[PDB]
Amino acid sequence: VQYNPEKPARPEDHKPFFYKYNTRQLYEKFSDDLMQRAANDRKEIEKINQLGKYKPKKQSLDEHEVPEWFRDAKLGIFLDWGPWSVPGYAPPGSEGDTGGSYPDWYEFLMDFTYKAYHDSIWGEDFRRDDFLPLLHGNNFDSEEYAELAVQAGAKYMVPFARHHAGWTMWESKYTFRNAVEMGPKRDILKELVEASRKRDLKFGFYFSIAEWEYPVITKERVSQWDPYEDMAIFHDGMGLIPRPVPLASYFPARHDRMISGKIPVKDYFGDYMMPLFKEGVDLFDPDLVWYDGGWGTPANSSRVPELSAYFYNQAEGRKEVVINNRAGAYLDDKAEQIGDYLTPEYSIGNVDINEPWEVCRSISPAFGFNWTDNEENSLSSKELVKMFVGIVANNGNLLLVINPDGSGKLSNVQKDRLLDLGQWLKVNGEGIYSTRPWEIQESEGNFFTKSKNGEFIYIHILDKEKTTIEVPNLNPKNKGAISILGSKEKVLWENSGPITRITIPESFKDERNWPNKYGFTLKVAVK
């Protein structure tokens, strides 16, 4: 029952969590029915793709274009919440190759990289699924999360609808491992989509392709030591740590309490994943699909191309939609990809400025709550603004991860950063939303954007140690063509051959006279 979510550890009278049905019980009651229902959905998907514009082929899917709303959005919120939020930890030195830290991998890595921590803090008898009842979500207010996104200046919201251990934020007909059956006992994704739609936030559907473990029905026994000859555990390469592939032996006392709620199938992809995706799309009508966890199986074999075509086709002539690039390797036997935009993770890297892209990260290294995170290891508001503008100037969006604890509460450090960014965007948003890169992006610590129609150039000034700005080939319309967003203060400037030389007004030498203390923005009418 009781833990402090801000310093989470084993409760004093921990009892094991047994879902009303174990995995064999779920097999005996639900598997056949689920597999029949899945067969029907697959036929529906095939027909929609038959009738529709888009076919499950790269050639066909690549012709879909990034919508204007996505290019114009610039800022999204990535709502990284789930059972992993309860322990809310990754240890020092366990960073991924991205450079990020992954508390949101705790459910898997508790038996591996994070096991020393788990053994001492939670106990060796505390299983993955024991976290599910502890994810009560009593401070999780879906209305306030949508409002916070708005107040942060975000134009889209992507909750972690279903991550790699298979727990769905929505009430599903294809799994009892869902938010109504387990944890907060409410349809969290439904609350969030309703809260988002009534605020004009675009809504993204985050969907893990593979899962770390899934119980499957087999035609032969895996080994002679197995209690069941008709059942196994399915893996692909998603977990990165080598496991038996495709099948591991199934042992109830080992597996049941890391797969609570999951109904066995013969075919993980066809019988479970495909219809679960369809259900999410059909129920929630997302504007965006954010695939993840598809590096373990080629997109050809996982059948994600059919899901991508479906998503496009059920939207055609209703709304413009977009998909990320994480469907997996697209082969025709590195590989190629499908999807509308690249998703560099934590570290921006070398980006192609010609095509819109999206970086995902939180204000710290953490993907998922880390209870040890605080002001000193997180971005300052100043650093966040600076980082955001740099992203936008280079044709990117920021999908800003936020990391609530097991109660669903967001730390003040994270709240304050979001509200400071949003308050900066309230003033300077005209130089951000619906902008495109200019022929210069960054110069002398100043950042440039242009309005998509080309009438205005914006210059974001973040450093109070500045007096003159020299901009080659700016070409202001007339001597009154330069102003400051959110201010009446007149900007004096002169041309000097090709270079425009701007003197910062006297009052703006001190950043307490700025409309917003984290930066001011010059608006330049050009032509």
Region of 180 on the Ramachandran plot (φ > 0 left; ψ -120 to 50 alpha; else beta)? alpha
d(CA 123, CA 464): 52
Amino acid at 469: I
Query: Considering the rule CB under 8 A, would residue 51 count as an interface residue with its own copies?
Result: no
- Tell me which of its own copies, Na ion, none is bound by residue 252, counting a contact when its beta carbon lies within the kind-specific cut-off of 5 to 8 angstroms: its own copies
Stretch that binds its own copies, among 74-82, 175-183, 246-254, 410-418 (CB under 8 A): 246-254
Phi, psi values for residue 247, rounded to 5°: -125, 135
Residue in 13, 124, 332, 333 binding its own copies, rule: CB under 8 A: 124
Binding its own copies by CB under 8 A: which of 180, 240, 351, 413? 240
Q: Which residues contact 349 (CB under 8 A, 6 or more apart)?
A: none
| In the complex, least distance from residue 237 CB atom to its own copies, rounded to whole angstroms | 10
Pick one of 68, 125, 439, 463: the residue that binds its own copies (CB under 8 A). 125
Name the amino acid, one letter, at 208.
Answer: S
Binding partner of 62, given Na ion, its own copies, none, CB within 5-8 angstroms per partner class = Na ion
Piece of the chain touching its own copies by CB under 8 A; list 116-124, 333-341, 441-449, 502-510: 116-124
Collapse the DSSP code of 145 into the 3-class scheme (helix H, G, I; strand E, B; otherwise coil) and give the result. Answer: helix
The site partner of 109 among its own copies, Na ion, none (C-beta below 5 to 8 Å per kind) is its own copies
Instruction: Choose which of 115, 199, 490, 527 interacts with its own copies (CB under 8 A).
Output: 115
Q: Does 121 bind its own copies (CB under 8 A)?
A: no
Residue 116 contacts its own copies per CB under 8 A? yes
- Binding its own copies (rule: CB under 8 A), the pick from 1, 9, 39, 241 is 241
Q: Are 235 and 248 in contact (CB under 8 A)?
A: yes
Q: Is the CB of 215 or the CB of 396 nearer to Na ion?
A: 396
Question: Bridge partners of 523?
Answer: 458, 483
Instruction: In whole angstroms, give the CA distance from residue 524 to residue 456.
Output: 5
Say which residues have a Cβ less than 8 Å from residue 246's Cβ, sequence separation at least 6: 234, 235, 236
Nearest to 343 by CA among 37, 69, 76: 76
Residues at the contact surface with Na ion, assessed by CB under 5 A: 62
Q: Which does 454 bind (CB under 5 to 8 A by kind): its own copies, Na ion, none?
A: none
Q: Which of 2, 13, 92, 93 binds its own copies (CB under 8 A)?
A: 93
Please count the residues of the chain: 527
Count of residues in contact with its own copies, rule CB under 8 A: 32
364-423 binders of its own copies (CB under 8 A): none
Q: How far is the CB of 233 from Na ion (least distance, A)?
A: 37
H or E segment to which residue 215 belongs? strand 214-217
Indicate whether 101 belongs to the interface with its own copies (CB under 8 A): no
Using CB under 8 A as the binding rule, whether residue 248 contacts its own copies is answered as yes
Shortest Å, Cβ 265 to its own copies: 20
- Kindly give, in sequence order, each residue whose CB lies less than 8 Å from that of residue 164, ignoring residues fewer than 6 positions away: 105, 107, 108, 208, 210, 211, 212, 238, 239, 292, 293
Choose the binding region for its own copies from 1-9, 76-84, 107-115, 462-470 (rule: CB under 8 A).
107-115
244 binds its own copies (CB under 8 A): yes
Q: Which residues, numbered 173-232, are part of the site for its own copies (CB under 8 A)?
A: 222-227
Q: Considering the complex, what minimum distance in angstroms separates the CB of residue 21 from its own copies?
A: 18
Q: How far is CA 290 from CA 127, 195, 396, in A?
A: 29, 20, 16
Report the alpha-carbon distance of residue 221 to residue 446 in Å, rounded.
65
Q: How far is CA 168 from CA 84, 184, 215, 264, 445, in A?
A: 13, 12, 17, 16, 43
**CA 157 → CA 74, 192, 370, distances in Å?**
12, 9, 21
**From its own copies, Na ion, none, interface partner of 125 (C-beta below 5 to 8 A by class):** its own copies
Closest by CA to 199, choosing from 244, 152, 238, is: 152
Among 18, 50, 112, 506, binds its own copies (CB under 8 A): 112
User: What sign does the CA torsion over 203, 160, 417, 367 have?
Assistant: negative
Instruction: Choose, by CB under 8 A, the member of 121, 180, 247, 413 that binds its own copies.
Output: 247
226, interface contact from its own copies, Na ion, none, CB < 5-8 Å by kind: its own copies
15, 59, 92, 253: residue in contact with its own copies (rule CB under 8 A): 253
Torsion of CA 293, 299, 303, 304, to 10 degrees: 60
Select 64 or 163, whichever has its Cβ closest to Na ion: 64
9 belongs to the binding site for its own copies (CB under 8 A): no
Chain centre to alpha carbon of residue 253: 33
Torsion of CA 453, 457, 459, 460, to 10 degrees: -10
Look-up: residue for tokens 């709240």? 415
Q: Cβ 107 to its own copies, closest distance in Å? A: 13
Residue 119 vs 442, nearer CB to its own copies: 119
Contact residues toward its own copies (CB under 8 A) are: 93-94, 96-97, 109, 111-113, 115-116, 119, 123-125, 222-227, 240-244, 247-249, 251-254
